[PDB]
């Protein structure tokens with residue numbers, strides 16, 4: 001086939017999409033699986049003054065494979081407002097609604113030249129991009145597999161389970177992974193006991209990202 | 225009929241269930257609608273040393289209507305662990321799983337003596353109480369109407385919409401209300417524009433709790 005595509009969403013902004021995407025692409029590249037990182041839609045940015053956005057971080061990693069890449073090759077709709085993409089678009093670029101057909105073509109074109117195309121979303125599964133589409137709708141149009149990153153604090157059970165319910169209600173292959181930060185052992189005492197129970201009872205277990213690089217590479221690449 | 229029952233859940237722990245429950249019961253009581261506040265399951269508590277739990281706050285309000293009430297009349301399963309109720313029960317009281325049939329009877333008994341019975345949950349809709357039941361399952365067994373309180377920060381769109389999807393997938397009457405705190409005007413600039421759009425497109429709008437005491441009293445009391 002052409003390259004596989006993995007969408008990375010999250011329980012919440014700041015949960016760890018970019019951290020975990022970069023760690024997974026680094027692992028895949030070190031294993032010989034040629035992997036690009038894309039951030040098609042990004043809010044909260046000011047490219048004139050700041051070179052630290054998700055797309056900038058992705059670009060640095062990506063240029064290890066292709067020096068010719070530039071920011072506009074990997075990120076397409078960019079906004080100053082710290083908001084849902086739909087509202088940032090309506091306010092800053094009223095005449096250019098986000099075109100997910102166009103995004104789908106652009107992203108799929110990278111499956112010619114990479115074994116894996118990782119696509120970071122923004123906001124959350126239900127965050128609106130157009131009047132008719134949210135991030136999940138975008139992921140569904142892409143026909144990507146889904147990696148949902150969860151935070152590692154109290155509340156992760158509820159947040160993971162809300163996302164599980166939405167995702168299992170749709171036709172896509174997905175995996176929920178907790179981004180377990182350094183210095184957190186409350187997790188193991190408070191939340192992990194339920195994750196373990198849930199996993200005995202579920203055909204699609206919740207994993208810990210840091211434990212799961214090999215499993216998540218396998219997941220991303222499996223099948224058609 | 226007997227008294228109505230309203231379950232209060234939230235997008236997240238600390239979103240404002242207890243604050244909003246107390247404000248709604250105060251309003252209802254001031255309108256002549258005799259209203260009790262119940263906290264059937266509570267984690268994170270130490271009653272030997274602290275008289276500030278949700279059940280204690282509810283009890284103070286409730287004793288304005290019935291001096292004879294005590295803590296054990298309005299809260300039934302109480303745990304020290306700051307966790308999901310299921311894990312706190314398994315660790316602290318292994319031989320007493322939470323009995324939602326029993327809770328249902330206890331809570332329904334208050335519909336003899338009150339016009340409205342407000343029931344605060346814990347944790348979130350998907351938080352586990354028994355091996356087979358979460359908070360939503362409990363609310364469904366109660367045949368209560370549902371008030372879901374959302375936080376007022378960035379992320380509320382995603383969180384409200386995840387809960388909306390779960391709730392609309394079940395057979396219950398529900399209302400999502402944002403607990404808009406004092407000193408937050410970022411809300412109006414960042415999140416409200418989408419809430420307004422959503423509400424033009426939805427048959428069940430997301431409201432702002434502070435704007436909605438009368439509407440939410442009407443909601444709680446309407447019909448059978």
Ligand SMILES: Nc1ncnc2c1ncn2[C@@H]1O[C@H](COP(=O)(O)OP(=O)(O)OP(=O)(O)O)[C@@H](O)[C@H]1O
Pocket residue numbers: 010012013014015016017018019020054122123179180181182
């Ligand atoms: N495992 C981790 N260990 C330490 N720091 C982390 C970890 N994961 C995330 N962080 C830090 O938390 C912050 C948020 O992480 P990150 O940018 O990966 O999240 P995000 O989900 O991509 O956010 P956004 O929604 O803005 O795209 C960053 O400063 C990051 O360095």
Ligand SMILES: Nc1ncnc2c1ncn2[C@@H]1O[C@H](COP(=O)(O)OP(=O)(O)OP(=O)(O)O)[C@@H](O)[C@H]1O
Pocket residue numbers: 234236237238239240241242243244278346347403404405406
């Ligand atoms: N509208 C508000 N204005 C000011 N403070 C608020 C507001 N709502 C909540 N708070 C404060 O935020 C904290 C959490 O609120 P509250 O206890 O109502 O949340 P909760 O959802 O009931 O939490 P829990 O999940 O622990 O039951 C409390 O200290 C409360 O006083």
Ligand SMILES: [Mg+2]
Pocket residue numbers: 017018019054120
């Ligand atoms: Mg990011």
Ligand SMILES: [Mg+2]
Pocket residue numbers: 241242243278344
């Ligand atoms: Mg409370």
